[PDB]
C-alpha cells in the first residue's frame, strides 16, 4: 500500500508544476497512510515470534506490525502541518453544522492563511516523506544483511533530501550537507559491519547468524569472535543516526539549521524504526550462559553510549539559548534512557523500552507542535528586540530562541500550560506519563543489578531539569516582549467576510478584525489530545501497558 | 600479593595511551603549522596527565590490596581517590585535589560495590521465580536472626532478658542483683 | 589486505581532508569500493553468487548516494558560493 | 556555613562549575564537518579499544572523569 501510494502520488506529481497542488498532495498522503493502518491492523491476528516473508528476505512480528502502525499514525499527525493552513477566521455566525456543511465564507485569506508560504509550495514534500516511511517500515521487517543496508539507505537518503528540500535556504542546504556527509560516514560503518558478518559466516540471513551464535553458547579453531565485534561496528553506525553520544554532534546543528515543520519528522521517525530493529538483534544475540563471548558483547557500546548520552545530553543543554539546540540535547538525554533499557535485556526492561519509545515520540511531537503553533500565533503580535531582528531564516524557524518565549503565558495561557505539562513530562514529574516511563526503566535496571547506571540517570535528570525549568521560567515568570499589532487591532481597518448558502446566494456580510483570527483547529485539537494523554495517563494506563506486556511475552516465550 | 610497581606501569600504558591520540587529535585540529613533532611539544602534557592519572590509579589500587590481602570494592576507591588527587596536582590547587579525589574516589567505590554493568552483571543461574517468591513469603524469621542483627535491649527485651541480664551485670561489676522486698508484709 | 589499506585511505581522506567537499564525497566512494572488494573476494573463496549480488547492490546504492550528494552540493554552492572547506 | 560553604559546596558551587563545564563542551560544537568526522572516528576508535582489549571498566570510568574534568579546565 505504501509502495502503491508512492507510485500513484509520483505519477500525478510528475505531470504538474502547479505549486497550489502541494496542500492537496499532502491531504491525499494522509488518506494513503490511513489505508496502510487498516492493512497492518488486519494482519494482527496471529501469535508468533516471527514469520519469514518473500523468500526469507523480510519478516513479520506482532512487534513489527504494532510499530509500522505507530509510524503511520505519527506520520499522519506530522503530515497535518503541510495539509492545513496555520491560521483561520472564526465567527459565531459561521459555527453550526448547517453553516459548516451548507454555507460558504468568502474573504481575502491570502495573507491571513499564508496560502503562498514555503511549507505550502513544495510539491514533492509528502512524496519524499513517504519514501522515508517506506524505508523505516522495511527496516523493522528486514531479516537479511543485504535488506538492512538497502532499508537504512532508503530511510537515510530521504532524510538528507528532506533536510535540503528548502533549496533557497542557506541554512537548510548547510544542515542538509552536514547530515548527508556524516551519515554517509555512518553508513560506511554499517556496511563494514554487515560485510564482516557474511565474510566470516558465509550467510546473509540474520536467522542463520542467530543459530550460529546460539550453538557457540556452550558454557577451538573457529571461536566466533566476529559476531560481537562485527556487530559493534554495525552498532556505531546506528548510534550516529539516533544521535546517541559520543556520535551526537551533528544533531544540534542540523536540527537547528533545517526548518521546524521539517525538524519535527526528521527528529522523531528515525529513532522509532532504528530502536525497534536493534531490539530484536539484542534479544537474539544474548548469551544466557556466561562465556568468553559474553565478555566482549557488542551491547556494551549501548551502555557506554547510554552513560555518555546521559551526561552529555543534560550538561551541554545547560547553556543552550536556542530552542532547537535545546530540544536536540533533550533528545540525547532521552535516548540514554532508551539505550539503558535496550542494554538490560529482560522482560521488565523490554516493556520499559517499548513504553518509553512510544511515549517520548508522542511527547517530543507535542513539543514540536506547540513550538510551531506559538510561532504562527505571533502573527498579530509585534516586538522591538534587536536580537529578534538579527535572526536568520525567520520564516523557516519562527521561534529560534528560548527568550522569544518570554511572557508567553500572558499572550496565550493554555498553550503555555500545554508546553509546561509537556516539558514537566520530559523532566519525569508525576503523575505525568514521562514520569512513569522513566520509573519503568529505573525499576528494570534496579532489578537487573545496573545500580550504578540508575544512579547516573537520577543525578543526570536533576541537571537536565535545570534547563527545562529555564524554559518554563521564561514562559511564566517575566512579561511579554511581544505586543498586539497596533494596526491589526485599531478599530478602523476591518476586512469584509460574506456568508453564502448552498447555492451561491448571499446571507450575511460581516466586518472582521484581528481578534477574529485564530489557530486552525487541526493543530489545537492535536495539541489538546496529547496534552491530555500526558496529563491523565494514570486513569487510562491499562490497555497501553498491557499491549507492551503481551509483546514482550511473545518475544521471550517458547 | 600483586606486583604493584609492575602493575601500575601497565595501568599507565593503557590510560596514557588513550591520551596520546587525544593529543594527536589536538595537533590535527590546530590552525597553525607546527609540524609532526609537535605531538610532544605542547600536547605532551595532555598525554603525561593521562599517563600520570592512569598508573597512579593502578599502583595505589594495587598497593592498597597488598597492604591487607583482600579483594573488595574499597581498594578501587583508594586508587581512585589517589588518581583524582593526582589530577589536581597538575592544576596546583588544594580544593581541586580534594574536589577531584572526592569525585573519582566515590565513582570507583560505587561502581565496584554495585558492579557496573559495563562488563555485564552477575548471572542468576537460579530460579528467578523462586528467589522472588522466597524473599516475599519469608514473613516470620527465627528470633535468633533478629537478635544477631539488632542485638538485645533498647526495647528488644525477649523472654529471658532479666535472667541473663542479672548474670551479665555480675560478670562485669561483681554485684548481685536483688530488688528490695518493698513491702511491710511478705 | 588491500581491503584494509583502501578502507583506511578513504576514511582518512574523509576525516583528514582540508580541501573541498567533492573530495569528501570521493572518499566515501573509496571506502564502499574497498568493502565491495572484500565481499567480492570472500564470495569467490566460498563459491557464493550472493556476494557478487551483494556487491552489485552496493554499486547501485553507491551511485545513488553520489548523485544525491552532488545534487545537495550544487544546492549548497548556489547559496554559499564555495564548496571549499575552511580551516583558520 | 549557611550563606557560605554550604552554598559553595552545593548549589552555588555546582551552578558555577556546571555552567563552565557545559560552555566548554559547547565549544567543540564548531559546526564544521571535518571536525565532526574526526570526533566520530575518535569515538569509533575508543569503542574498539574498549571492547577487544578487554579493558577493565574502571579505566573507562576514569577516562570519562578525566575527560570531564579536563573539559572543566579551561583552554
Amino acid at each position: 500500500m505504501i509502495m502503491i501510494s508512492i507510485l500513484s502520488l509520483l505519477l500525478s506529481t510528475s505531470v504538474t508544476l502547479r505549486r497550489d497542488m502541494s496542500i492537496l498532495f499532502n491531504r491525499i498522503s494522509i488518506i494513503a497512510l490511513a489505508y496502510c493502518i487498516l492493512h497492518d491492523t488486519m494482519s494482527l491476528s496471529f501469535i508468533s515470534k516471527g514469520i519469514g516473508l518473500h523468500g526469507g528476505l523480510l519478516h513479520i512480528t506482532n512487534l513489527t506490525q504494532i510499530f509500522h502502525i505507530f509510524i503511520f499514525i505519527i506520520s499522519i499527525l506530522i503530515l497535518q502541518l503541510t495539509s492545513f493552513y496555520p491560521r483561520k477566521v472564526w465567527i459565531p455566525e459561521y459555527s453550526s453544522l448547517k453553516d459548516i456543511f451548507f454555507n460558504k465564507i468568502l474573504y481575502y485569506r491570502t495573507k491571513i492563511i499564508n496560502k503562498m508560504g514555503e511549507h505550502m509550495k513544495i510539491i514533492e514534500y509528502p512524496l519524499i516523506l513517504l519514501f522515508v516511511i517506506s524505508g523505516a517500515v522495511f527496516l523493522i521487517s528486514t531479516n537479511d544483511l543485504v535488506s538492512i543496508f538497502l532499508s537504512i539507505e532508503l530511510q537515510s537518503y530521504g532524510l538528507y533530501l528532506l533536510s535540503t528540500i528548502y533549496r533557497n535556504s542557506e541554512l537548510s542546504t548547510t544542515g542538509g550537507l552536514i547530515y548527508f556527509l556524516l551519515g554517509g560516514l555512518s553508513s560506511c560503518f554499517i556496511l563494514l559491519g554487515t560485510s564482516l558478518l557474511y565474510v566470516n559466516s558465509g550467510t546473509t540471513s540474520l536467522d542463520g547468524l542467530y543459530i550460529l551464535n546460539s550453538i557457540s553458547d556452550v558454557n577451538s579453531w573457529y571461536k566466533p569472535y566476529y559476531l560481537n565485534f562485527s556487530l559493534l561496528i554495525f552498532s556505531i553506525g546506528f548510534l550516529f543516526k539516533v544521535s546517541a553520544a559520543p556520535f551526537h554532534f551533528w544533531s544540534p546543528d542540523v536540527y537547528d539549521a533545517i526548518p521546524t515543520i521539517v525538524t519535527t519528522f526528521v527528529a522523531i521517525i528515525a529513532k522509532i524504526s532504528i530502536f525497534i530493529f536493534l531490539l530484536e538483534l539484542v534479544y537474539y544475540t544474548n548469551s544466557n550462559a556466561n562465556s568468553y563471548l559474553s565478555e566482549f558483547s557488542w551491547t556494551y557500546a549501548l551502555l557506554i553510549s547510554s552513560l555518555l548520552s546521559l551526561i552529555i545530553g543534560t550538561v551541554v543543554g545547560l547553556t543552550q539559548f536556542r530552542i532547537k539546540r535545546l530540544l536536540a540535547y533533550s533528545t540525547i538525554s532521552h535516548v540514554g534512557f532508551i539505550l539503558l533499557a535496550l542494554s538490560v535485556s529482560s522482560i521488565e526492561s523490554t516493556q520499559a523500552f517499548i513504553f518509553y519509545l512510544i511515549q517520548y515520540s508522542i511527547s517530543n511531537l507535542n513539543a514540536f507542535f506547540i513550538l510551531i503553533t506559538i510561532g504562527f500565533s505571533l502573527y498579530g503580535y509585534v516586538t522591538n528586540n534587536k536580537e529578534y531582528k538579527s535572526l536568520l531564516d525567520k520564516n523557516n524557524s519562527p521561534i529560534q530562541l528560548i527568550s522569544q518565549l518570554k511572557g508567553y503565558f500572558y499572550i496565550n495561557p493554555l498553550l503555555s500550560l500545554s508546553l509546561a505539562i509537556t516539558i514537566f513530562s520530559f523532566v519525569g514529574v508525576p503523575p505525568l506519563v514521562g514520569f512513569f516511563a522513566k520509573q519503568m526503566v529505573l525499576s528494570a535496571a534496579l532489578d537487573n543489578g545496573y545500580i550504578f547506571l540508575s544512579l547516573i540517570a537520577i543525578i543526570t535528570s536533576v541537571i537536565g531539569a535545570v534547563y527545562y525549568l529555564n524554559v518554563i521560567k521564561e514562559i511564566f515568570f517575566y512579561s511579554p516582549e511581544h505586543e498586539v499589532n497596533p494596526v491589526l487591532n485599531e478599530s478602523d481597518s476591518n476586512f469584509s467576510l460574506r456568508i453564502l448558502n448552498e447555492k451561491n446566494v448571499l446571507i450575511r456580510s460581516v466586518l472582521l478584525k484581528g481578534r477574529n483570527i485564530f489557530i486552525s483547529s487541526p493543530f489545537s485539537i492535536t495539541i489538546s489530545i496529547i496534552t491530555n494523554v500526558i496529563l491523565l495517563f494514570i486513569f487510562m494506563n491499562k490497555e497501553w501497558l498491557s499491549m507492551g506486556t503481551i509483546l514482550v511475552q511473545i518475544l521471550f516465550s517458547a | 600479593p600483586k606486583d604493584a610497581v609492575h602493575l601500575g606501569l601497565k595501568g599507565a600504558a593503557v590510560v596514557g595511551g588513550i591520551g596520546l591520540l587525544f593529543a594527536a587529535v589536538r595537533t590535527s585540529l590546530a590552525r597553525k603549522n607546527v609540524g609532526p613533532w609537535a605531538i610532544f611539544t605542547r600536547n605532551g602534557k595532555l598525554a603525561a596527565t593521562f599517563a600520570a592519572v592512569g598508573g597512579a590509579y593502578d599502583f595505589t589500587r594495587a598497593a592498597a590490596a597488598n597492604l591487607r590481602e583482600k579483594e573488595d570494592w574499597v581498594n578501587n576507591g583508594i586508587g581512585g581517590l589517589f588518581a583524582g588527587a593526582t589530577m589536581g596536582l597538575t592544576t596546583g590547587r588544594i580544593p581541586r585535589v580534594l574536589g577531584f579525589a572526592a569525585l573519582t574516589g566515590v565513582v570507583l567505590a560505587t561502581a565496584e560495590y554495585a558492579g557496573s554493568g559495563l562488563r555485564g552483571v552477575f548471572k542468576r543461574d537460579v530460579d528467578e521465580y523462586e528467589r522472588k517468591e522466597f524473599l516475599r513469603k519469608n514473613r516470620r524469621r527465627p528470633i535468633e536472626e533478629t537478635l544477631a542483627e539488632i542485638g538485645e535491649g533498647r526495647g528488644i527485651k525477649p523472654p529471658g532478658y532479666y535472667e541473663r541480664r542479672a548474670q551479665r551485670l555480675k560478670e562485669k561489676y561483681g554485684v548481685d542483683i536483688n530488688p528490695v522486698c518493698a513491702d511491710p508484709d511478705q | 589486505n588491500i581491503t584494509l589499506i583502501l578502507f583506511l585511505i578513504g576514511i582518512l581522506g574523509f576525516v583528514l581532508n582540508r580541501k573541498n567537499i567533492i573530495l569528501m564525497l570521493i572518499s566515501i566512494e573509496i571506502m564502499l569500493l574497498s568493502i565491495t572488494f572484500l565481499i567480492l573476494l570472500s564470495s569467490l573463496n566460498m563459491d557464493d553468487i550472493i556476494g557478487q549480488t551483494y556487491a552489485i547492490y552496493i554499486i547501485v546504492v553507491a551511485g545513488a548516494e553520489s548523485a544525491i550528494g552532488l545534487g545537495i552540493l550544487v544546492a549548497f554552492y548556489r547559496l554559499r558560493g564555495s564548496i571549499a572547506i575552511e580551516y583558520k | 556555613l549557611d550563606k557560605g560553604s554550604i552554598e559553595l559546596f552545593g548549589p552555588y558551587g555546582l551552578e558555577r562549575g556546571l555552567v563552565k563545564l557545559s560552555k566548554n563542551i559547547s565549544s567543540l560544537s564548531t559546526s564544521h564537518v571535518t571536525t565532526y568526522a574526526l570526533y566520530i572516528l575518535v569515538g569509533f576508535i575508543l569503542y574498539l579499544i574498549y571492547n577487544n582489549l578487554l579493558l577493565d571498566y574502571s579505566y573507562l570510568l576514569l577516562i570519562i572523569i578525566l575527560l570531564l574534568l579536563l573539559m572543566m579546565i579551561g583552554e
Binding site: 565474510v199 | - | 581491503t3 583506511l8 572484500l38 | -
Partner: peptide, 26 residues
C-alpha cells in the same frame, strides 16, 4: 589511527583472504 584500525580489522578478515600476505601451501 592507521595502526589501531588495521590491527583490529586484521582479525575480523577470514583465512580465505589473509592467505598470501619457505613452506608455502598450494
Amino acid at each position: 589511527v592507521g595502526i589501531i584500525i588495521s590491527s583490529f580489522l586484521f582479525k575480523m578478515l577470514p583465512y580465505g583472504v589473509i592467505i598470501s600476505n619457505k613452506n608455502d601451501l598450494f
